[PDB]
Each structure stands twice: as C-alpha cells, then as structure tokens.
C-alpha cells in the first residue's frame, strides 16, 4: 500500500474537486470573487479537506500536478459562465512552495486566464512570507512574469515591521491575508486587536488589499469594515461549496 500511488490513482480518477468559497466586499454587497479549495471526494472516506492531505502530497512530489488539474477544472467549470461574473471577479488559489520554485506556474496562469474574456477575471495566488525570504532569481522572474499577466499575489504568515516591509516592497505583493485566529478574537482580546491594527497599518503603508479570513459574526464584519478591510470570507459569507451551489447562487446575484 503506497500512499503516493494512491494519490496518483486519485488524481487520474478526478477525485480532487474544486470547492468555491465566496469573497464579499468589506462594506457588503454582491460577491466579488471566490477562493478555490481542493477537496478529495474519496469514494469510501467521503469528502476530505485539504489540510488532511495537501501536506503529504507536497512530500510525495504530486502537489504541482494536482494544483494544475485543479486550475484546469476551474476553467472548465467557470469559463463558459462569464456572464454570471461581474468583470474583475477574483479567483484565488493556494499555491504550494514547490510550485513557486518553477516557472511553469506562469503557463498555468496564462492558460486559466485564456478560458475567460480578456481582463474579465483577476487571478490571485496565495503564498507565505517564507517564499519571499527564501527567494532566488527564479522567484524574481516568476513574480515579474505573473504580474505582467495581471495576476495578483497574496501573502500569509508575515511580519509587520520594517524587515517584512522590505520583502513585500521588493516583490510588489498585492494583498495581505488576516488569519482567522486573529479575527476570532475580535472584541475578546486587546492584543489581537493590536495585531489586526498592525496588519492594517502595513497594508496602508504599501497600498495593499486585505482579505480577512474566518469572518463568522456581524461584530467581526463591522470591525473589519471600520478599518477598511477590502474583502471578507468565512461562515458569515459562506462555506466552500461545490460548483452546482456556486452557479445557483451566482444566478441569483446576476438577477439583482
């Protein structure tokens, strides 16, 4: 029994499925994008969330082909429904460290964007600060080519002081994520509020967009809107959903 051969079997059998989590403007309104999350629809185990297998797939050496297949499925799922997406609609992916160490990522992005009318979507790739600190000439070239396509880069797991500012500036990152762990402590923990304020301050300094994760309550939403946070995701906005559910909801929003 080979876990790595099982992952390859699964990939060939199209068991890795995109689930779509909506992003909302901080001030409310129609969804402005989705973040794509890879689930494994395992015939015996049921639906498995990515934190339960992505780390192993990275170790196995399979994460890039899996992410490529995911990007391909999203093009097939949404590229024929551009009329349901308001121009500029964001489509976000979590990109693994190994995918960042290659230039094939540029071609993967170029292909996904070609499935929609030019400029119609904004592709957003989410990386960690480690990918900026542990960078090389490949990184420099990758970020420059992706930016020239109109791809935007979002960063998680970052510092907020002048040392981190230098990396964010060098690579001309576009967005910061607010981790759910800070959002969950809005109104309950003073320090967390200070951390959140520090992230907002860095964003203002570098003119970055902010996506806040794990937004579950109206209190959290209003706190974050009060600080100009651009985009929200979490239970309040909606859980990750299968394509059928997304299309149903988009149809409704196009009608209003």
Numbering used by the authors: 5 to 260
Article passage:
DGC domains containing the signature GGDEF motif synthesise c-di-GMP from two GTP molecules while EAL1516 and HD-GYP171819 domain-containing PDEs are responsible for the hydrolysis of c-di-GMP to 5′-phosphoguanylyl-(3′-5′)-guanosine (pGpG). Hydrolysis of c-di-GMP by EAL domains has been shown to require the presence of divalent ions, either Mg2+ or Mn2+, with the most efficient reactions occurring at alkaline pH2933. Here we report as yet structurally uncharacterised EAL domains from the core genome of Pseudomonas aeruginosa, PA1727 (MucR) and PA3825.
PA3825 is a two-domain cytoplasmic protein consisting of a structurally uncharacterised N-terminal CSS domain, with a predicted fold similar to the extracellular receptors of bacterial dimeric histidine kinases, and a PDE domain. The β5-α5 loop of PA3825EAL, residues 160–170, undergo significant changes between Mg2+-c-di-GMP bound and metal-free-apo states. The β5-α5 loop moves towards the active site and contributes to the formation of metal binding sites via two highly conserved Asp residues (Asp160–161). The restructuring of the β5-α5 loop and the functional role in metal coordination is thus conserved across different dimer interfaces. The substrate- and product-bound forms of PA3825EAL are characterised by changes around the α5 helix, consistent with an activation step from the apo/ground state induced by dimerisation.
